[PDB]
């Protein structure tokens, strides 16, 4: 849970501007767009990183390349790699980060409009963020479906298979016989309808606020290299302040910087620590963390 700054440079001043914006607009809400970066401190192993037990187990299983684990065609040809990844990444195996709790705090302070997440760890939800305020753009393990006919399955059937040694006889649909998999969006598949539908509504929400208070969109821990999620930042209204908290300047913040864009090169947990301090919610935050 303990964090430190990424470099000798202080980000407190840049973070302060954010707190200042909120102080001036007490009735405004914030929309977060987050990625894998906010869960790194949770110890979630990156399947794309050598030196991680998961990466090597997938390699041993003959997975051709990391993202083939999230490819429908490969899954149907050999589901073991995905089942192996599921066993290690199944929700409940990790705990929320300080940043995840920051989202909960904003919710408590009623300043959270929505959190769009590319992560499949569901740590936002595990941390207490309400279902109505979360958009899991890439799905989750909360639901299972047949990739053939779409019949719905409770997640428990799939999960039970993960505790077997070895993992074999994968879950098959009792209607059409095809493989059943968690409602995780695989590469090549469309995102859930709620993604575009909710962005449509939040987009109108953002624009109508420009003409009233002034909202704020904060992008955190994402390389903005996966679409269509990566298209959101550029679609943010020109007149709505954008903030990017990432170790590196990426995506639209790099391709088409905007005068009001506020770039903060900092670890998400340190960012959270500094923001709570500047907002003056250390007391409430400390409570959530000790809850």
């Amino acid at each position: 849970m303990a964090s430190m700054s990424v470099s000798t440079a202080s980000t407190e001043m840049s973070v302060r501007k954010i707190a200042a914006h909120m102080k001036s607009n007490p009735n405004a809400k914030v929309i977060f767009m987050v990625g894998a970066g906010i869960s790194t401190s949770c110890g979630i192993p990156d399947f794309r990183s050598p030196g991680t037990g998961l990466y090597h187990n997938l390699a041993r299983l003959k997975l051709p390349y990391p993202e083939a684990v999230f490819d429908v065609d490969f899954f149907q040809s050999d589901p073991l790699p995905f089942y192996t990844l599921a066993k290690e990444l199944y929700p409940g195996n990790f705990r929320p980060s300080k940043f995840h709790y920051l989202l909960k705090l904003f919710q408590d302070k009623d300043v959270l409009k929505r959190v769009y997440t590319q992560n499949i760890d569901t740590l936002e939800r595990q941390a207490g963020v309400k279902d109505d305020l979360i958009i899991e753009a890439h799905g989750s393990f909360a639901h299972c479906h047949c990739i053939g006919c779409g019949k719905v399955y409770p997640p428990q059937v799939f999960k039970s298979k993960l505790a077997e040694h070895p993992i074999k006889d994968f879950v098959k649909c009792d209607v059409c016989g095809e493989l059943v998999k968690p409602a995780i969006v695989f590469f090549g598949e469309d995102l859930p309808d709620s993604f575009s539908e909710t962005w449509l509504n939040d987009s109108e929400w953002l624009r109508e606020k420009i003409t009233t208070q002034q909202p704020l969109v904060i992008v955190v821990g994402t390389s903005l290299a996966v679409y269509p999620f990566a298209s959101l930042p550029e679609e943010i209204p020109r007149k709505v302040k954008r903030v990017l908290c990432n170790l590196e300047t990426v995506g639209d913040f790099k391709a088409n910087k905007r005068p009001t864009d506020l770039i903060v090169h900092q670890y998400s947990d340190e960012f959270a620590e500094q923001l709570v301090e500047e907002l003056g919610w250390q007391e409430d935050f400390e409570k959530i963390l000790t809850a």
Binding site: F187, G188, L191, D193, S196, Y227
Partner: peptide, 8 residues
């Protein structure tokens, strides 16, 4: 709606 999950 944006198309399928991808890097493109």
């Amino acid at each position: 709606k944006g198309g399928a999950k991808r890097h493109r």
